[PDB]
């Protein structure tokens, strides 16, 4: 049986693990004197005994008690690892020669994409651009080699651990050879480091070794990106990224920031959190007027030094009696640390250069110093003070908040539903409000009075929204852990850390709890529930079974993440979902007009809301949904509940014969009477309280207001009409408004007990900090590098999956191009990390050893003979470039460097392959395709056309992915290989609603094929509407979620282990997906075709149609076959006698246009809507879970209007999924006015909108005009719809206008795009001749029954009209 350990930091650095481990190892309190150190010394853990008993560390401990070696805390060793340089003359040669090779192969791989693009745009290395870059990057700099050298040594110590710990369990790596002078002992359960020359030792969690590896990676990536960028910006001053860093100042900025973590220990991260504070102030100092910048900078230097005082006061507090007592430096006690902090901030200031491009990307500096060991008890001891505290409110300030919430709801219903929400209490109102009710309108905020927001607070409603009477299993299931119920809570602590009367108690309490309650992960909580039924959430919600419930705990775990037993987690997720479905539509913010902006942060914001300040509005929602206590559950239940730090190494001290923890004495890490405000829970509700309260502040201040809230931030922009007194400037008036309104915002937040401190709020004129990103003058100043930092060998995978790793290196290295605006810096940086992930890191995969690399060695040897290439390295240049759909190495197809979405992936996978093959075959991509004296491009297309037809289940596979090819002609996704492994497991789950479904699922997958099989012209997106309508789709989401866990075969056998059954199938998947290119391109005279494909007059979209059809043996496939814009458009720079095409023009004045804004509205490209009429019925009576089922049914009514059997097909669907006869349901369907469901339909499988591969702001520099194309497209195609998307013809234009600048250093004044008309076909909607299999349709609905959306009862239908 096998365990596979993490490859990157996920979760947290556990402080109480480092404490528990180090305290036992040395037999004295290590990081802190709190209870984990005492219990770990009394009764050590077996996972740690197996460390301490090693004949190496038993020697180190004997050396420590002899006093020859000195004990240190892991941020000390972070500094020693990072400021380490060692050279053996051969060692520094080797680490240099490896990085010279990685760079050379990344440029020799990137060259074919640049030669494809520069040959298309008509602008061992072929392109002289990369030949100049290769002459430049020929010697790596000594500050980079040092980060790559440390990365290679920490990655090697880790890959030498993980691959050995797969090969045998319980293995502890002991290594003093890999990284010089250091000795590591490394285990899943702990790490030890010793430095001999410095006579010092640290003990730390495994996740901290992952963190030093990921810090060395993060700095390797910053030095790679900014060295690539600095070499690109030495050739053309617009080709590399937006920023312009000097790297020796980055490497010092890193080594100073580790040196403050050496001084301040773990507490030094309090200061590193205020790097955000300093970088915001350097941005503000450039852009804002004096009164705003002077004020921000002063309020920031307060934060940084309050954090350094707090770091010192905490550090000297915790260390007092620990084994660390003598390990805190004189530079702290004498205060000389202010000098160091001044050198660190003076480096941030110098790196930022007073250049706003550096200062937006310099946000990466927040993430590059590692993570605090978060003390899982102190994070509670510092929060109970905010949450046990009594709050005082004026009854007027409560009333005006409840009235502002009700006013936003009356304004909400009157906007959306042309009505007031129905009132039980209308007889409260005065005549000038009864008049607004009876006329079904409202006063606007200027007509509104604060006395009005009192009398509106007195209203009570009648029920308008309705609760779903079934559990939505896809909303309610996710992979993550959950708390045991109260009486089993001690199961979260390792058995040795519990006293005897807990161990021999809990082993008699597990005997009176059901198998669900014991399970402590969300999946297993449902899968083990052998008395589940779909109503049993609703039937507890209206029954109030969460009020004063004896199973309740809140459990806090590693920034604290809070969780509670399944019955309450259901109520939380429903209380949060009903706000999202039904209430967010009312709160979509989720002489001179003097103008202000105020920003506020919502970290504290949950802990402030007591019952009285959020239940008042939540009781408005409890009325409207007709239920007592659903939205107010949080403050009504949690005050009765003990809150426990349940992190594994963090137990409470329990007094003798106490077992029920509503009777365990309060202590560090365990307390009672939390007066509501748990983190993340009710976040959607408190966003409604923020937006409501702001429309009371705006009334009291008599100013216009606009609000934006997302996650942890709110941003507010304010205008007050004011008449200026003499000598006052606009900036002086804007600042007085900002202060008068900040005074009011503080007053009214304190009026709801939410005290505020100026660390969390600041005032600004026009600078904004939405979504962590910086806008000045409406130009985007990107944070690109902050996204890219962790790009490396096994990212975002399960089981180190080669395909998901490649796709996710591609996905992240787009942020240098979509935000960073440099294509060639994306390619070279990506082709470093892909070449590293393929040519280096596959030689030592964790699960497979050489086996994935020996399978690339046969793929490369195969490509060599197929393409007549001269070396296996240039066969790898080709593998690394052709697309993953054909089992190649390249995750980011050459289309998505210009438009972010395509209606068809196959034609782009073929065109990407056409463009790259021009490198070898010396074709020109501007010309029509022709005969040449080598066949290699024709021979590739001949093998794409010519294959043996092996379709299986050819309709249900087109239902579950409308793009798909099958016949073993595509790489197999994790989901399709694993759906059998999941269903064989779920067919053994005690939960009937999963068991009966998974027992029948492999017969429903046959009936769900055979339903549609008869209908003649197959329309895959129309199949997808049928798929999403049928109950099997919600049953498939569950299987597709569970098919993406690690350990699939072991889910409900309670191990973190992975069964070898899954290492076998994952190896089968990876080894087939790699080798696929030898099956797609066979050497066998290409299925005996002694004539290779004639490409004279060839159209690549017609070849793409023929292949997608042949791959299913379907006679016609319709609507998916849309062309590749990038291949149809020829590009020209002056209007010749042709006088035709789509013209894109620079409306900005100057010659460059990156980082500058034009006069035009920005562009996102949006797809002509599925034109329809909504019929008159009471819309709100139907839950989202069935109100979207009615639109899927309505799509089927107009798509499949033409079938032989429309009436029976809609009847057995509507009696199935709606529970209504067809002619009575037809009243509720939108009636679709658009003619052509091929050209205009909406479903998940079809792109909604078509953004350009450019940041949105830059599109404003350009104007687009389709008039010259419309002549030839109208009168070659008879004013009929054509198989193309103009939204990508524009988005290809706007991005080509950016990429042509980057390669030439001028933004060209005009581009003309001229279609190759061969790629454009009539998109005529067909008669869907054939009969639906109505019995097979009933069988799908019956076997599925449990997953159906709720049936419309006549009780609900009469109210609906």
């Amino acid at each position: 049986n096998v365990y596979l350990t993490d490859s990157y930091l996920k979760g947290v650095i556990s402080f109480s693990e480092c404490n528990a481990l180090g305290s036992y190892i040395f037999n004295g309190p290590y990081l802190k004197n709190d209870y984990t150190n005492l219990i770990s010394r009394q009764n050590p853990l077996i996972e740690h005994m197996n460390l301490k008993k090693l004949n190496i560390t038993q020697s180190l401990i004997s050396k420590y008690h002899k006093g020859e070696i000195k004990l240190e805390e892991p941020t000390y060793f972070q500094s020693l690892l990072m400021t380490y340089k060692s050279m053996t003359s051969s060692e520094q040669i080797a680490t240099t020669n490896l990085l010279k090779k990685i760079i050379r192969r990344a440029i020799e791989i990137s060259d074919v994409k640049v030669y494809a693009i520069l040959n298309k745009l008509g602008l061992t290395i072929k392109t002289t651009l990369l030949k100049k870059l290769m002459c430049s990057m020929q010697h790596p700099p000594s500050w980079l080699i040092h980060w790559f050298n440390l990365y290679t040594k920490l990655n090697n110590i880790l890959t030498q651990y993980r691959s050995n710990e797969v090969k045998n369990h319980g293995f502890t790596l002991i290594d003093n050879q890999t990284l010089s002078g250091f000795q590591f002992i490394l285990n899943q359960y702990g790490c030890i480091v010793y430095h001999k020359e410095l006579k010092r030792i640290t003990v730390t969690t495994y996740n901290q070794f992952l963190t030093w590896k990921d810090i060395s990676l993060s700095r390797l990536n910053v030095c790679l990106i900014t060295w690539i960028s600095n070499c690109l910006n030495t050739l053309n001053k617009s080709l590399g990224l937006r920023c312009g860093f000097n790297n020796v100042i980055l490497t010092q900025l890193f080594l100073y920031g580790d040196c403050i973590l050496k001084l301040f220990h773990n507490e030094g991260f309090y200061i590193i959190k205020e790097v955000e504070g300093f970088i915001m102030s350097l941005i503000l100092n450039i852009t804002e007027e004096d009164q705003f910048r002077k004020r921000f900078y002063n309020s920031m230097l307060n934060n940084i030094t309050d954090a350094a005082n707090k770091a010192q006061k905490n550090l000297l507090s915790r260390v007092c009696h620990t084994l660390l007592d003598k390990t805190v430096s004189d530079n702290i006690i004498n205060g000389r640390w202010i000098i160091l902090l001044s050198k660190f901030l003076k480096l941030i200031k110098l790196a930022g250069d007073n250049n706003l491009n550096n200062l937006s990307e310099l946000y990466f500096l927040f993430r590059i110093f590692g993570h605090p060991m978060v003390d899982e008890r102190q994070a509670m001891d510092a929060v109970k003070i905010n949450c046990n505290e009594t709050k005082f409110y004026l009854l007027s300030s409560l009333s005006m908040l409840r009235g502002a919430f009700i006013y936003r709801i009356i304004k909400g219903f009157v906007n959306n539903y042309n009505r007031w929400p129905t009132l039980r209490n209308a007889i409260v109102l005065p005549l000038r409000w009864l008049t607004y009710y009876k006329l079904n309108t409202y006063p606007s905020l200027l007509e509104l009075t604060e006395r009005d927001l009192i009398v509106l607070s007195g209203l009570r409603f009648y029920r308008e929204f309705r609760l779903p009477k079934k559990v939505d299993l896809e909303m309610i299931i996710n992979d993550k852990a959950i708390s045991p119920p109260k009486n089993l809570i001690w199961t979260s602590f390792p058995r040795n850390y519990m006293p005897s009367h807990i161990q021999n108690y809990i082993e008699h309490e597990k005997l009176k709890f059901s198998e669900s309650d014991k399970s402590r992960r969300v999946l297993e909580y449902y899968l083990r529930d052998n008395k589940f039924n779909e109503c049993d959430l609703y039937n507890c919600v209206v029954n109030q079974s969460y009020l004063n419930n004896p199973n309740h705990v809140v459990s806090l775990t590693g920034r604290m993440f809070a969780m509670q037993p399944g019955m309450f987690r259901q109520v939380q997720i429903l209380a949060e979902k009903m706000i999202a479905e039904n209430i967010l539509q009312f709160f979509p913010e989720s002489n001179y007009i003097s103008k202000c902006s105020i920003i506020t942060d919502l970290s504290k914001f949950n802990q402030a809301f007591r019952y009285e300040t959020s239940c008042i509005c939540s009781d408005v929602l409890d009325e409207l949904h007709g239920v007592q206590s659903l939205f107010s559950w949080l403050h009504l239940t949690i005050p009765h509940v003990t809150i426990i730090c349940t992190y594994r190494h963090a137990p409470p001290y329990i007094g003798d014969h106490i077992v029920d923890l509503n009777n365990v004495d309060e202590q560090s890490g365990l307390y009672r009477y939390h007066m509501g405000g748990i983190e993340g829970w009710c976040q959607k509700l408190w966003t409604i309280e923020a937006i409501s309260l702001l429309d009371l502040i705006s009334l009291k201040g008599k100013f216009s207001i606009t609000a934006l809230i997302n996650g942890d931030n709110q941003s507010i922009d304010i205008s007050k009409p004011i008449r200026l007194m003499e000598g006052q400037t606009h900036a002086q008036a804007d600042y007085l408004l900002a202060l008068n309104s900040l005074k009011l915002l503080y007053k009214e937040y304190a009026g709801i007990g939410h005290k505020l401190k100026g660390t969390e709020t600041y005032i600004s004129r026009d600078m904004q900090f939405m979504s962590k990103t910086i806008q000045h003058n409406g130009v985007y100043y990107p944070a690109s590098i902050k996204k890219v930092l962790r790009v490396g060998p096994w990212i975002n995978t399960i089981l180190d999956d080669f395909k998901v790793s490649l796709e996710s290196i591609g996905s992240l290295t787009q942020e240098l191009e979509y935000r960073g605006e440099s294509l060639l810096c994306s390619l070279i940086f990506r082709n470093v990390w892909l070449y590293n992930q393929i040519a280096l890191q596959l030689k030592n995969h964790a699960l497979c050893n050489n086996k994935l690399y020996l399978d690339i060695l046969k793929v490369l040897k195969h490509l060599k003979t197929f393409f007549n290439l001269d070396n296996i390295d240039t066969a790898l240049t080709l593998y690394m470039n052709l697309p993953m759909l054909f089992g190649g190495g390249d995750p980011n197809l050459l289309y998505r460097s210009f438009y972010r979405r395509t209606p068809d992936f196959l034609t782009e996978a073929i065109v990407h392959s056409v463009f790259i093959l021009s490198y070898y075959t010396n074709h020109d991509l501007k010309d029509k395709l022709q005969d040449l004296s080598d066949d290699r491009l024709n021979k590739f297309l001949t093998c794409i056309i010519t294959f043996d037809k092996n379709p299986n289940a050819e309709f249900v596979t087109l239902m579950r992915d409308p793009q798909a090819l099958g016949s073993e002609r595509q790489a197999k996704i994790t989901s399709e290989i694993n759906r059998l492994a999941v269903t064989e497991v779920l067919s053994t789950a005690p939960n009937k609603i999963f068991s009966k479904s998974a027992q029948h699922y492999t017969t429903t997958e046959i009936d769900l094929n055979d339903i549609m099989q008869n209908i003649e012209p197959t329309y895959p997106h129309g199949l997808r509407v049928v798929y999403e309508s049928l109950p099997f789709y919600k049953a498939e989401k569950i299987v597709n979620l569970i098919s993406g866990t690690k350990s699939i075969t072991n889910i409900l056998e309670k191990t973190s282990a992975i069964d070898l059954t899954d290492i076998d199938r994952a190896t089968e998947m990876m080894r087939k997906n790699i080798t696929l290119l030898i099956r797609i391109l066979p050497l066998d005279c290409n299925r005996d075709k002694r004539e290779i494909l004639s490409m004279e007059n060839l159209s690549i979209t017609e070849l793409s149609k023929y292949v997608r059809e042949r791959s299913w043996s379907l006679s016609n496939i319709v609507g998916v076959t849309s062309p590749s814009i990038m291949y149809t458009m020829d590009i020209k720079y002056t209007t010749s006698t042709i006088s035709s095409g789509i013209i894109i023009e620079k409306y900005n004045v100057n010659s460059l246009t990156r980082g500058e804004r034009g006069p035009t509205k920005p562009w996102v490209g949006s797809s002509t809507q599925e034109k329809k009429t909504m019929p008159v019925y009471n819309r709100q009576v139907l839950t989202k879970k069935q109100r979207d089922q009615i639109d899927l049914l309505a799509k089927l009514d107009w798509v499949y209007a033409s079938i032989d059997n429309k009436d029976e097909f809609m009847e057995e669907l509507s009696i199935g999924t709606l529970g209504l006869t067809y002619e009575k349901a037809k009243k509720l369907f939108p009636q679709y006015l658009s003619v052509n469901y091929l050209h205009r339909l909406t479903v998940s499988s079809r792109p909604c909108e078509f953004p350009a591969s450019i940041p949105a702001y830059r599109t404003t520099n350009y104007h687009f005009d389709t008039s010259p194309i419309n002549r030839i497209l109208t009168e070659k195609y008879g004013d009929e719809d054509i198989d193309i998307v103009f939204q990508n013809c524009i988005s290809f234009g706007l991005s080509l206008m950016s990429v042509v600048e980057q390669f030439t250093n001028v933004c060209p004044n005009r581009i003309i795009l001229i279609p190759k008309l061969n790629e454009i076909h009539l998109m005529k909607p067909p008669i869907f001749t054939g009969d639906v299999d109505i019995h097979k349709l009933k069988q799908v609905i019956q076997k599925q029954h449990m997953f159906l959306p709720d049936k419309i009862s006549l009780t609900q239908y009469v109210e609906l009209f």
Partner: protein, 57 residues
């Protein structure tokens, strides 16, 4: 005339409804649910009154 002095009564008499009703919602707190009182202060609501009709059958 006297309606005009009486509109000046009603817009104050209804301002009292808002204040006292907010005080009832705010008073119906965690320790009302401890004592199982809460539904007596705020009144029974549609989805539970509906449930009582299914028990009536």
């Amino acid at each position: 005339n006297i309606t005009a002095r009486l509109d000046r009564i009603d817009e104050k008499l209804s301002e009292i409804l808002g204040m006292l009703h907010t005080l009832v919602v705010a008073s119906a707190g965690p320790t009302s649910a401890r004592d199982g009182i809460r539904d007596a202060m705020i009144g029974l609501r549609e989805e539970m009154i509906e449930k009582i009709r299914t028990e009536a059958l």
